[PDB]
Design a protein around this ligand. Structure first.
Ligand SMILES: [Ca+2]
Ligand SMILES: [Ca+2]
Ligand SMILES: [Ca+2]
Ligand SMILES: [Fe+3]
Lengths: 107, 107, 107
């Protein structure tokens, strides 16, 4: 998948987590979020199509994506421990990082 | 998973997409298809077991697998946008690329 | 996800496989197990936090993780062929490798 194809996957999975009832539904959706970032970190968003791979703007994008995989991993551990409530709470903060990263490179 | 283990995963997920009702069912199955190709592109099919990694026959296999991940990504974006109909239509063309690649290296 | 976050994912997915009714439920959970190992093989467990990357104890961990991905792949192929019974049987042996690896680096 390209960049925004996995970005929209993160957005939809956040909508699945907010309506998920058990911990298995939250965990599987969070792993789909981690998976969507596993193949999209290597892709390039539309705005940075003509930015150097060593350009600080393109470098910012990689690390901003690295925070995302880090927060997703923390919510996965909370959902893995059975804390379905605290994992959904961590998913609401994930929604902030996903939306901020998605709007900065949407164009 | 080995090569044909993920090939049969693509075939079964295509059967899940053709019977999927909502867009979330199509998107998750398509990401399972992208995931099945993410770890099987690095594996080697049975026929090419004794073919050089730089052999044009083995090289053909890698690129033919690269088309597959590209088509899967396009269907993921269609399913991510909510176009459950057009994503299923793209999945039927995916069935052509999966079956052609699966039969050429099945043996 | 970090190391134990994916370790607990393997444990929960084993509980999903033992209660899965059809072959698609077993296959998807097994691919979640393969996915959980795809990003956790590159992480480091708590005990080996201060062990050299070329240390035989840290080297043992990588190969012990490599057996895990190999067994998961074999159960995926059994579940892909439709053998839902034999794949669940392979999942019970997977439970031995997961639990042995999980307890050796849990601390
Ligand atoms: Ca609900
Ligand atoms: Ca149906
Ligand atoms: Ca049951
Ligand atoms: Fe990878």
């Amino acid at each position: 998948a390209d960049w925004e194809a996995a970005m929209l996957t993160l957005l939809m999975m956040l909508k699945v987590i907010e309506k998920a009832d058990n911990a298995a539904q939250v965990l599987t959706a969070l792993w789909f979020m981690a998976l969507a970032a596993h193949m999209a970190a290597l892709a390039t968003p539309p705005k940075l199509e003509d930015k150097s791979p060593a350009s600080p703007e393109m470098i910012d994008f990689r690390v901003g994506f690295e925070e995302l995989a880090t927060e997703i991993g923390k919510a996965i551990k909370l959902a893995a421990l059975g804390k379905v409530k605290e994992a959904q709470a961590a998913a609401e903060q994930l929604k902030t990082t996903v939306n901020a990263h998605w709007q900065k490179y949407r164009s």
